[PDB]
Amino acid sequence: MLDAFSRVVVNSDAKAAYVGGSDLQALKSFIADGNKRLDAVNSIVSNASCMVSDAVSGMICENPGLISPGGNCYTNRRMAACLRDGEIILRYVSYALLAGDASVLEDRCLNGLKETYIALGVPTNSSIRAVSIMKAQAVAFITNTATERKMSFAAGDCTSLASEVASYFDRVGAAIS
Amino acid sequence: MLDAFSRVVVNSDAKAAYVGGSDLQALKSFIADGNKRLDAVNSIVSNASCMVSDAVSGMICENPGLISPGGNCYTNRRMAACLRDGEIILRYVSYALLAGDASVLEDRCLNGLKETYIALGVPTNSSIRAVSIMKAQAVAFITNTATERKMSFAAGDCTSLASEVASYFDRVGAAIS
Amino acid sequence: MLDAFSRVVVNSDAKAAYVGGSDLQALKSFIADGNKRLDAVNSIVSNASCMVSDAVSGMICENPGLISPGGNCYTNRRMAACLRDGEIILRYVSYALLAGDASVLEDRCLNGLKETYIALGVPTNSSIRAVSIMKAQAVAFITNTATERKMSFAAGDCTSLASEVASYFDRVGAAIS
Amino acid sequence: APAKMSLEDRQLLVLQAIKQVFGNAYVMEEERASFAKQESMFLSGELSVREFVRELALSDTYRRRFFEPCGPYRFVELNMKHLLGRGPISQAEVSQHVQCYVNNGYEAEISSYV
Amino acid sequence: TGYDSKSSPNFPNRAATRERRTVSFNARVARNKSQAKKILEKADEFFARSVTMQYKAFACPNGVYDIQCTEGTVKGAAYEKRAMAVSAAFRAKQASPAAKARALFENRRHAIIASHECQHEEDLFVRFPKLSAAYMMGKTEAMRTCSRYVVPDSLEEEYMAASVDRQMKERACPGGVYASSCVEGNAKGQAEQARVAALATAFRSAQKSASKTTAERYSSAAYGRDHFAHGCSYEESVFNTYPATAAAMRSKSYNY
Amino acid sequence: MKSVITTVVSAADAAGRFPSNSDLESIQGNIQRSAARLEAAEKLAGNHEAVVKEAGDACFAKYAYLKNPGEAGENQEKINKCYRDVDHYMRLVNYCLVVGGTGPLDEWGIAGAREVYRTLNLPTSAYVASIAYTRDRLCVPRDMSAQAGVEFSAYLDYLINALS
Amino acid sequence: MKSVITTVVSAADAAGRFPSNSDLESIQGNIQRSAARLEAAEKLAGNHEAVVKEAGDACFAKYAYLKNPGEAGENQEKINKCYRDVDHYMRLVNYCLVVGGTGPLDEWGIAGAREVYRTLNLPTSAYVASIAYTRDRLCVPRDMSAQAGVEFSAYLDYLINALS
Amino acid sequence: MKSVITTVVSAADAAGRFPSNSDLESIQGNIQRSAARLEAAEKLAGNHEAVVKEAGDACFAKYAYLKNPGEAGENQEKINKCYRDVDHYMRLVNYCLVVGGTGPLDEWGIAGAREVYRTLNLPTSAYVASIAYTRDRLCVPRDMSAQAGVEFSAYLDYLINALS
Ligand SMILES: *[C@@H](C)[C@H]1/C(=C/C2=NC(=C\c3[nH]c(C[C@H]4NC(=O)C(C=C)=C4C)c(C)c3CCC(=O)O)/C(CCC(=O)O)=C2C)NC(=O)[C@@H]1C
Ligand SMILES: *[C@@H](C)[C@H]1/C(=C/C2=NC(=C\c3[nH]c(C[C@H]4NC(=O)C(C=C)=C4C)c(C)c3CCC(=O)O)/C(CCC(=O)O)=C2C)NC(=O)[C@@H]1C
Ligand SMILES: *[C@@H](C)[C@H]1/C(=C/C2=NC(=C\c3[nH]c(C[C@H]4NC(=O)C(C=C)=C4C)c(C)c3CCC(=O)O)/C(CCC(=O)O)=C2C)NC(=O)[C@@H]1C
Ligand SMILES: *[C@@H](C)[C@H]1/C(=C/C2=NC(=C\c3[nH]c(C[C@H]4NC(=O)C(C=C)=C4C)c(C)c3CCC(=O)O)/C(CCC(=O)O)=C2C)NC(=O)[C@@H]1C
Ligand SMILES: *[C@@H](C)[C@H]1/C(=C/C2=NC(=C\c3[nH]c(C[C@H]4NC(=O)C(C=C)=C4C)c(C)c3CCC(=O)O)/C(CCC(=O)O)=C2C)NC(=O)[C@@H]1C
Ligand SMILES: *[C@@H](C)[C@H]1/C(=C/C2=NC(=C\c3[nH]c(C[C@H]4NC(=O)C(C=C)=C4C)c(C)c3CCC(=O)O)/C(CCC(=O)O)=C2C)NC(=O)[C@@H]1C
Ligand SMILES: *[C@H](C)[C@H]1/C(=C/C2=NC(=C\c3[nH]c(C[C@H]4NC(=O)C(C=C)=C4C)c(C)c3CCC(=O)O)/C(CCC(=O)O)=C2C)NC(=O)[C@@H]1C
Ligand SMILES: *[C@H](C)[C@H]1/C(=C/C2=NC(=C\c3[nH]c(C[C@H]4NC(=O)C(C=C)=C4C)c(C)c3CCC(=O)O)/C(CCC(=O)O)=C2C)NC(=O)[C@@H]1C
Ligand SMILES: *[C@H](C)[C@H]1/C(=C/C2=NC(=C\c3[nH]c(C[C@H]4NC(=O)C(C=C)=C4C)c(C)c3CCC(=O)O)/C(CCC(=O)O)=C2C)NC(=O)[C@@H]1C
Ligand SMILES: *[C@H](C)[C@H]1/C(=C/C2=NC(=C\c3[nH]c(C[C@H]4NC(=O)C(C=C)=C4C)c(C)c3CCC(=O)O)/C(CCC(=O)O)=C2C)NC(=O)[C@@H]1C
Ligand SMILES: C=CC1=C(C)[C@@H](Cc2[nH]c(/C=C3N=C(/C=C4\NC(=O)[C@H](C)[C@H]4CC)C(C)=C\3CCC(=O)O)c(CCC(=O)O)c2C)NC1=O
Ligand SMILES: C=CC1=C(C)[C@@H](Cc2[nH]c(/C=C3N=C(/C=C4\NC(=O)[C@H](C)[C@H]4CC)C(C)=C\3CCC(=O)O)c(CCC(=O)O)c2C)NC1=O
Ligand SMILES: C=CC1=C(C)[C@@H](Cc2[nH]c(/C=C3N=C(/C=C4\NC(=O)[C@H](C)[C@H]4CC)C(C)=C\3CCC(=O)O)c(CCC(=O)O)c2C)NC1=O
Ligand SMILES: C=CC1=C(C)[C@@H](Cc2[nH]c(/C=C3N=C(/C=C4\NC(=O)[C@H](C)[C@H]4CC)C(C)=C\3CCC(=O)O)c(CCC(=O)O)c2C)NC1=O
């Protein structure tokens, strides 16, 4: 696949130019918050049994028509696949939040995922109420500005890592609808 | 589209005969009960604001889910065109009542209605509950059991003809699922 | 459009006039003699190809100057287009055979042809005479004086309906000249 | 070996099914070059990984290895080790796989398993 | 034997994909996105049909027919009209791959001009190939911004209805060749028919009513000011005083 | 307009084909059921200023909300605007009852009706509660016939659903 | 596709409207005349090959030049084909009187007649000489009933007028 | 969806042209009068729930007759079918007083509102009177200034005349 260091060597392979002192400053500034990258990744997988589960205890809480009979989240055959559906979407973002490039998320998860919901009848306004939650909590986890879970970290700004994980959520968002 | 005179032409063209007297006994049953075929249609279209209104305002009490967003009826356009989608659900059957077959129904709109329903994301649990709640009120204006509406017609029985529209909307129910 | 059924209706609309028993005898003069109206029109449309077929060879056996070099029937378009201009004008009179008003024939064809018959030189003297070759036999088919095709009708009278058709050969004959 | 093929990790996905289907045998590069249509026809997308396994088994080298020295019980267990990854069950499922060869040929014998 | 035939081992039979090279997707992605291809081609032949039959309700806004629907006037030439009516699709099918690419996006040029007023209108229009290739046809057969329902009143205007139609004979030929769009016959099953069918409905161009053909000179006039003459006010001063220039000159995607 | 008769001839001028047995049923058809229908058309205009006042009064109990200051039917002179309009919509239907059409129902009454009635704020169900008085106060034993007095209520609905 | 039943309901899709009461009187008037078109249906089907043998050898004498060698009907195989191709003329009106309108005739026998009679070189004078024989050799009160003499006769010369 | 940006770059795209100084000069007026227009968004997050009891109960004193069984507010549960629709109109103008223009309002707010209401017997004359209490209640010192006083109130007046 690709990552954030694999991206720049194929940016420069089109020029056939050696990576020297020009674009190595972006990657020597990668490692300065390279610890802060990993210090934000384990904040996702700490409370991930709660993260997929307020996505069904809040989404149905303001849209109970999905659990109507004949609905898309009606039966428990579908519900075990629906929690299976939401936990891989949280899994591939954390693969791309860690590696710093979106090209493990689009090419292995998302190409075809537009027509997973076309070919089945799964809606689009349902799944964006199940992914605008996850764009709100995962930028409220990584500040530790949440209410219950309190990661007692070292102090300092992390809002470059907030917009980094935020770019994936419209990258997952524009692909599914 | 065709008529049920010519549906017996579909029952005769592949054998290519001169059409006799013994095989129009269900076609001179068409002229024997053709007043009764047409004595059903006026209590439908007199109640043209009654038949559409409880199709949508029956859905809201028995299913309060889709009104809140993430739902298939949220806007006023989702009230102005959803009542308009059931307008031609009734109208494309309204030619077939006097005719006697499926000449006008599936060749003109239901050649794949579910391939139209997928691309906008039309909820087929709402579609089945649309065409079943109006077919249950269609024959109730025929069997004279409406909670307000009482007519003054001729005497007899249309339990033979009650499976005309009952065999219509179950094919409208077939193509939407 | 308007029929003779509606030309008696808009002769009462200006003065707020409600209709009585002497006003529905403007249309029960129609319908009880309307069995003759079905008995009149269907035998001039049966033989309708030999109307103009006698009105072309009979036109040049009574006037052999129309097929002159520079005439309006010399080129082989100008006889193949010449029977187009007179076959459907029988139907425009046959549209007034069924209706009883002549305000459709001047307003579907004859609103703009006599100023274009000058715009390519279609003559005005045998305009009404080219009406006047089948004008014998079409009144003589509905009143049954025809010799080569004598009919088998429900016998009686159509002489009040024969001045109906004598009004309308000139009403398409007025607006061509 | 997973789904969702790239073009870089076709080199993992091919030889983790050469090694399965040839029964961990040594397939030299002169014998690898005999697959040069059907190994190419997998890296297009003409052939999925269920049907490349049939196209590896319908080769000349699989006919040379596990059909030309191998007798009739040694034939039907080296199909079953390589195509399904298991041993036979009873006597009824060997002779039902015997007469898929004799009455209707060998290419319908191998493709009965797939 | 004891012979027996069960069901098929290959009953889907690859009836979904015969392009025979994907972009190396999958087996599961390659099955259902080919199942989306047999669905999302089959709503392109719905949504262009299901509003143009609603645009055929403007042809009978009361319910009965005026002379919009002059179909074939002489009795035998109703089935003679249907030969080049179905060849209007067949000759549009065999258009060039340089022309088939621009038939997409130059149908998308005025598609967002007709759908700027509602965002629920433009999302369907940029998601279909053959919707706005029929919607631009289906909107101008209703409120009559073609030449099919408009007559020249001025001979001034008949010199300018005949001024840009040879520019619609310009772009139906890239050289000395002729294209498949500006044709007139296919198998000599006619004699003079495309001039016969023109002057039969050119009779209908001036006798529907007066008020049928006067607000259409205030319908088609601001139409071309919105669509074409919005960037050059010399071009709309030939449009407003002469509405035989705005109902004439067309889009470039569908040809002539 | 749109009648029994001009719906038959609307096909032939379009398609160009000449009238055979396509155009041979409908004009024969309204000889067979019009005898109660011309009975019904005079039955409106035999007592029509009574049935102007029989229908148009009862909605002012259900809709008394114009008599306050700040509405359309405010003073006494809107009653002169009120019952003049009751003289007019029933004229569209007994004109049609000699024919059996829905033409001046659409040529005169309801074409463009949703534009004007939200412009000038014409209350829709305030009309229908006076209008459906004639739908319900009917004894087809005694008052009219049940052959085509029901056709009069198969055409008074076409006021009602198109005003709603 | 062109009957009494599908008069307006194919054009009501071009209207945005339902079957109203302009659309329902027009079928009942066929039903009082539906007791004369089945009295011609199996009457024709009960005399189906004795009206072949009447009409058949009548037209071979009227144009005797088609029995020459080197013409169209030169052999013996093509002259039972001319029995076979006037069979469906009197078999498609056996379909068409059932449906009331002009349904099976205008699409299956007549739609593009002379375009396959000219390049095939089939002169239609020798077609309709079989028809115009039995167009007027059909007595009214003895072959069938009295209204049935012109219940049959709407398409009897229209079949020649479709070739005219 | 309809503002200064979402109509001026369609005009450059229909003309096939880049942004020059034509649409550069015409878009910088968005921001200086946005500083007071967003103070109504900062106003009624804290009185989104108490202004609907002073103005959503101001369409009810004159229209107090409509609590009969059969009307719109026939039950307290059918005042509950008012209580989500009457405050959507202030919420749908809260969505587009963010944007400056009115582009969220003419997609789902009014854009096809009155096509249901005549069939569900809903009169919109009492819909105007609900926010006609907001036609007078906005303070010039206290709530916001009179620079944005008509910029609050013409958007209230935008939802008047689209219902007309
Ligand atoms: C796991 C349970 C974590 C946790 C995660 C967070 N959730 C946050 C916001 C949020 N919560 C819900 C569910 C809630 N909202 C409802 O409307 C309903 C019932 C109908 C429920 C149960 C949703 C749907 C959303 C986000 C969508 C939105 O923004 O509208 C969140 C951010 C705020 C916060 O600090 O709570 C986090 C961190 N929260 C927890 O308590 C445990 C530790
Ligand atoms: C079952 C579907 C019905 C029912 C039907 C019957 N109708 C009978 C007679 C009948 N109804 C009409 C009126 C019809 N003709 C029209 O022109 C119009 C308006 C468009 C309508 C509604 C007629 C003319 C007739 C025929 C004799 C008569 O006038 O009464 C009927 C009696 C048997 C028969 O047709 O001979 C039946 C059973 N009756 C029912 O109980 C439900 C409502
Ligand atoms: C078609 C064959 C009809 C038919 C038509 C009738 N034509 C009648 C009179 C008539 N025919 C002509 C044309 C003829 N006369 C000529 O001098 C020449 C050639 C130079 C031709 C071809 C004319 C001019 C007229 C007179 C018309 C008039 O007075 O304006 C006619 C009435 C006479 C009669 O009944 O014998 C009829 C019925 N005859 C048929 O029965 C088939 C169906
Ligand atoms: C003058 C134009 C005619 C003529 C007219 C009369 N026709 C009379 C009766 C009549 N004709 C028909 C047949 C009509 N109905 C159909 O369905 C078809 C097509 C298949 C046709 C042609 C009918 C049903 C009737 C009513 C009684 C009957 O069956 O005969 C008629 C008698 C008076 C009346 O209208 O009731 C007259 C005078 N007859 C003529 O000889 C001239 C040429
Ligand atoms: C004999 C006195 C005739 C004559 C007859 C021939 N007809 C030939 C072919 C043919 N005819 C029809 C029309 C008719 N048959 C149908 O099945 C239908 C409806 C579906 C209709 C209206 C058709 C369709 C055909 C083609 C089928 C076939 O080839 O049999 C025919 C052979 C063609 C040829 O001549 O090359 C003959 C000889 N021809 C005559 O010369 C006189 C008029
Ligand atoms: C009583 C307080 C009012 C009245 C209220 C009613 N409104 C009813 C339904 C309704 N309202 C809207 C508009 C609004 N809701 C939306 O979801 C959106 C768009 C996002 C908007 C602008 C709509 C679309 C509907 C229909 C479906 C729905 O409820 O959402 C209603 C129910 C009908 C009934 O009970 O008869 C009532 C009572 N109507 C009045 O006349 C008074 C003044
Ligand atoms: C007949 C002359 C013999 C006899 C023959 C039987 N052979 C049976 C089964 C069988 N035989 C072989 C060996 C041979 N057949 C092959 O297909 C091949 C190639 C691979 C060879 C070398 C095999 C492999 C089998 C399969 C085992 C099986 O079919 O069960 C057999 C069947 C016994 C049974 O029903 O289980 C018979 C009867 N036996 C005789 O009695 C005469 C002497
Ligand atoms: C403007 C340049 C248009 C355009 C106009 C043409 N139409 C032609 C033939 C034709 N068009 C229609 C459809 C028309 N009838 C309707 O009822 C409605 C909707 C209300 C519409 C739009 C029909 C039925 C016909 C058949 C008449 C005939 O030509 O035989 C036409 C002639 C060429 C052809 O299509 O064969 C022109 C130029 N055509 C266009 O491509 C643009 C969009
Ligand atoms: C023959 C007895 C006449 C005669 C007839 C000619 N008419 C010619 C052309 C023509 N006709 C019409 C009207 C026709 N077109 C329609 O669309 C309709 C109704 C729907 C009708 C009746 C028109 C508009 C035209 C112009 C050509 C066109 O259709 O575009 C004609 C050909 C003239 C020529 O080509 O030079 C002839 C010969 N002329 C006569 O002298 C006698 C009186
Ligand atoms: C009412 C108080 C007036 C009145 C108004 C009428 N105008 C009618 C038709 C009509 N109006 C226009 C102008 C309008 N259309 C436009 O396109 C533009 C802008 C460019 C404007 C201002 C036109 C062009 C027409 C002709 C219709 C058409 O073009 O299709 C009209 C209809 C007449 C009718 O129904 O027959 C009315 C009633 N007329 C009055 O009596 C008073 C003074
Ligand atoms: C309004 C929307 C719009 C677009 C988004 C673009 C996209 C676009 N490009 C082309 C068409 C083309 N685009 C290119 C472009 C390129 N080829 C190369 O080798 C380079 C990589 C690259 C630019 C330097 C070429 C060469 C063609 C013509 C194809 C040909 O004739 O060979 C066409 C077909 C147009 C037609 O002929 O009908 C379209 C829609 N053009 C548009 O009108
Ligand atoms: C053009 C239309 C037209 C009409 C409808 C009648 C209208 C009418 N209704 C009544 C008057 C009446 N009519 C009835 C009969 C009935 N009332 C009902 O509600 C029952 C459904 C129905 C039984 C068949 C009764 C019971 C009265 C007296 C009560 C009343 O309505 O005032 C009277 C007084 C004379 C009478 O009693 O008949 C008149 C003229 N006249 C017309 O010219
Ligand atoms: C449905 C098709 C159908 C038919 C064509 C006849 C067929 C037929 N034709 C005749 C036989 C005959 N039929 C007639 C009658 C007439 N000849 C004419 O030219 C006049 C128009 C008509 C008088 C009204 C005559 C004169 C004969 C004897 C000559 C012959 O055999 O053709 C007979 C013997 C009995 C009889 O005379 O009726 C029969 C069954 N029957 C049918 O069921
Ligand atoms: C969204 C709408 C909205 C409101 C209306 C207010 C609602 C509101 N009204 C009043 C209460 C009041 N507010 C006013 C002020 C005024 N009354 C008028 O008629 C003038 C327009 C204006 C002066 C410029 C007056 C006079 C009262 C007391 C009478 C009343 O209850 O309205 C108060 C108490 C404190 C205050 O006066 O502000 C509040 C919060 N808040 C809101 O969020």
Curated annotation (Swiss-Prot), chains A, B, C:
Phycourobilin binds at residues 50, 61. SUPFAM superfamilies: Globin-like. Keywords: Antenna complex, Bile pigment, Chloroplast, Chromophore, Electron transport, Membrane, Methylation, Photosynthesis, Phycobilisome, Plastid, Thylakoid, Transport. It is a peripheral membrane protein. It comes from the Eukaryota. The keyword Plastid applies. (2R,3E)-phycoerythrobilin 1 binds at residue 82. GO terms for cellular component: chloroplast thylakoid membrane; phycobilisome. GO terms for biological process: photosynthesis. Its main location: plastid. The modification N4-methylasparagine is found at residue 72. (2R,3E)-phycoerythrobilin 2 binds at residue 158. It holds the Pfam family Phycobilisome. It is found in: Plastid, Chloroplast thylakoid membrane. Contains two covalently linked phycoerythrobilin chromophores and one covalently linked phycourobilin chromophore. CDD domains: PE_beta-like (cd14767). Belongs to the phycobiliprotein family. Light-harvesting photosynthetic bile pigment-protein from the phycobiliprotein complex. Heteromer of 6 alpha, 6 beta and one gamma chain. This is B-phycoerythrin beta chain. It comes from Porphyridium purpureum.
